[PDB]
């Protein structure tokens, strides 16, 4: 029943081009604040890591951006066994002195200065408070989620040593490749909570797999080679948003959020990394096998950091079992329904 | 005879094994000239381009290339030859005191790139007597240091129809490689032309060579293993081991390893399915390649892979006769199992 699919599909391509335009402000606005930013000498080294993306697949006009603002030598200090979270220190003056608070770099100090100067260039479409990661513009009734990044050129830590297994899929010589490129810190408070805290994040390597994303490099490039990957992924967060939307009103499915299907997804893609795997006549039980993966994670309480092997997204200590168990019932009433959450 | 294929690639293997204690010493030395290049305001951001690579015939023989970013630059292309240019947007520029006119003299930056480099290794090397220098270090290792300018922007517009691995590597990656920098080197043109550069796109040669399937697992497991780049030692050591054999008529002097190279990119786009280049089908593959070459050298029609209006076997470049002196040669070592192997 793969139709109804289709469906949907047709329906958030048709959004995506109505919103091109909305873009092209998203654009002006961020080349403006950008320009603005790298005159103190802070965030002199700040730019952009497209320019935007779409965390809600369903919210068209709701933006995220990141900017990234690269940081050398630096030295980082695990927090608490966490594998994600870090204190930043420095090795070695150092432009971002001023936001140390004693040795480690403030992500209270940074983010207070960043809030500050986009307020002032925001001389300008209004600015919202965040609830680290750092502010919400909107922009001529478009909104735009700004998250401040440090950028790292040094070698990923050892968390991420097990983390990324596409050697099967993608290969060896690409993952050595993807683990020579940077990774990120977002500010990030730890759970009291500590401050100070950094999370990894590497959206960039998430962004470059799912576009380049077949064992064949012409995977979807001709009609021989056409892979629905990239839409089992768009109806995975689809159902996950529409779910969300439809159950807003109790506090089950708060804290679940597309970074969770698309983990889930990205370990689909390992153990099935064959293009024939995912012919796009098959999207109906590719779709399937995406979901019953999902609910598998559900259900044992399991879904590894696709970097970091050792971060649980789904431990108890993150999201309680009785809102596990609502999102796999509703989701399973979804699937053996055929999805009416999709009309 | 496809054993005797295999029985070659074995020898280079233990070859090549043999000499990397070479190959550690040239990087001791190019470490050295770097550094003080680097302290001349004019090669202040001079670096390496690949470390240094190999004639497969001759391991201890290496090629290192040096680059030099040049911001800003612009090209005029020379007498319609799509791949020399003359090199001139900013005014006096750490290469100023290279200048002639508004060109940047290719005489005068190898000349004092000579001389710093001569300088150098008196301070520790033989130089041998325009792409630059050969070093002899102790008396066993040869190194052929070529100067190349690199260009961040985009590449020239004879470049747009080349590079033509879309059907093979993919479009993806052909928009990728070409967002890289492209190189010039100094070499003459046409009497001859002095202060011409030509476009250089070896670190893209290196990246289709090693990153070579469809596949992107090509060659990282036994149901994967290709024949591509077995097939390409092969052709080089064969036009190395004929242009040896024949040195002193001289007529082979003029092929190089680049004319089998291009050939054999060319053979990939043609043959762009790794099922076409099984590791079982090298006998046919390694055949398939040879007669490649032989129609390239009997139409004397070989683009180049990146520059496809420069034809490399021009009656220009290379006479007729010496092209039918290596097409009887080729097709005597092929229809005889090709005792020059041995
Ligand atoms: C690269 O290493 C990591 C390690 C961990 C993460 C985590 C935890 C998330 C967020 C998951 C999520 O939806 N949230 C709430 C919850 O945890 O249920 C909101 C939030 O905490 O922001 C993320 O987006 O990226 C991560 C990346
Ligand atoms: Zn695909
Ligand atoms: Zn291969």
């Given at each position: 029943g793969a139709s109804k699919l289709r469906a949907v599909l047709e329906k958030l391509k048709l959004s995506r081009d109505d919103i091109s335009t909305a873009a092209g402000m998203v654009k002006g606005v961020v080349d403006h604040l950008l320009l603005r930013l790298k005159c103190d000498s802070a965030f002199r080294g700040v730019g952009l890591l497209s320019y935007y993306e779409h965390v809600k697949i369903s919210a068209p006009n709701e933006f995220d951006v990141m900017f990234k603002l690269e940081v050398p030598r630096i030295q980082l200090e695990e927090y608490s066994n966490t594998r994600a979270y870090y204190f930043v220190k420095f090795k070695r003056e150092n432009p971002l002195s001023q936001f140390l608070e004693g040795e480690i770099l403030s992500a209270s100090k940074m983010l207070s200065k960043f809030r500050k100067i986009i307020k002032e260039e925001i001389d300008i479409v209004i600015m919202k408070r965040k609830r680290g990661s750092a502010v919400t513009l909107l922009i001529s009734e478009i909104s735009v989620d700004i998250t401040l990044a440090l950028e790292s050129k040094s070698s990923w830590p050892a968390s991420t040593q097990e983390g990324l297994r596409i050697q099967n899929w993608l290969s060896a010589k690409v993952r050595k490749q993807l683990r020579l490129k940077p990774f990120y810190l977002v500010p990030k408070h730890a759970k009291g909570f500590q401050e100070e805290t950094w999370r990894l994040s590497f959206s960039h390597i998430e962004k470059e797999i799912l576009n380049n994303?077949?064992?064949?490099?012409?995977?979807?490039?001709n009609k021989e080679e056409k892979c629905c990957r990239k839409d089992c992924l768009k109806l995975m967060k689809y159902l996950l948003e529409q779910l969300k939307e439809r159950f807003?009103?109790?506090?089950?499915?708060?804290?679940?959020?597309?970074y969770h299907v698309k983990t889930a997804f990205f370990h689909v893609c390992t153990q099935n990394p064959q293009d024939s795997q995912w012919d796009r006549k098959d999207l109906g039980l590719c779709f399937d096998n995406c979901v019953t993966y999902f609910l598998q994670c559900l259900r044992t309480e399991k879904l590894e950091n696709y970097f970091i092997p050792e971060f649980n997204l789904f431990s108890s200590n993150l999201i309680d079992k009785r809102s596990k168990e609502f999102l796999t019932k509703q989701i399973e009433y979804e699937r053996n329904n055929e999805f009416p959450v999709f009309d």
């Open positions: 994303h077949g064992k064949s490099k012409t995977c979807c490039e807003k009103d109790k506090k089950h499915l708060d804290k679940f959020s597309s």
